[PDB]
Design a protein around this ligand. Structure first.
Ligand SMILES: O[C@@H]1[C@@H](O)[C@H](O[C@@H]2CO[C@@H](O[C@@H]3CO[C@@H](O[C@@H]4CO[C@@H](O[C@@H]5CO[C@@H](O)[C@H](O)[C@H]5O)[C@H](O)[C@H]4O)[C@H](O)[C@H]3O)[C@H](O)[C@H]2O)OC[C@H]1O
Length: 126
């Protein structure tokens, strides 16, 4: 089924750059559209999957750690808890999906950051 993951503060969607499938590609915000690189499926294993086999993936547990796509493998850094307030928390890190520098424009990067009430850490949809 899928579903976009749209940033509240930016009104832009969680987007895989160029619809790349390459391990390590950092996530960005982009104007929402119908493509597969903006479709995210939540799984029972706690994942946010794109293209079927790729996972939203935290490269570390520290502030400013890159959020990237990576081949799904079962790691806890590929597990996320989408809260009731729209925060997306990394299970391994206890840090939140965060649009870097409170950025809102196309191309602003996504990272892990200390959970706050910033609108750059709030996301809607499935
Ligand atoms: O030297 C340092 C750099 O390494 C660092 O770069 C970042 C390192 O982290 C990168 O992201 C993580 C990469 O590792 C992933 O976990 C892997 C997934 O693959 C598993 O192996 C598979 C096992 O099954 C086999 O059949 C198959 O062949 C294998 O693929 C492996 O066991 C796991 O460890 C994590 O999910 C990622 O988070 C990140 O992209 C880099 O930027 O930067 C600092 C530098 O000093």
């Amino acid at each position: 089924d899928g579903g976009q993951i749209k940033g509240v503060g930016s009104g832009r969607c969680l987007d895989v750059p160029d619809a790349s499938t390459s391990d390590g590609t950092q996530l960005q915000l982009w104007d929402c559209h119908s493509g597969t690189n903006q479709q995210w499926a939540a799984t029972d294993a706690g994942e946010l999957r794109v293209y079927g086999d790729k996972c939203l993936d935290a490269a570390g547990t520290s502030n400013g750690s890159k959020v990237q796509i990576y081949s799904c493998w079962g790691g806890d850094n590929q597990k996320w808890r989408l809260n009731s307030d729209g925060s997306v928390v990394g299970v391994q890190s206890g840090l939140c999906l965060d649009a870097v520098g409170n950025g809102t424009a196309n191309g602003t990067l996504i990272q892990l950051y200390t959970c706050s009430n910033g609108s750059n850490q709030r996301w809607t949809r499935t």
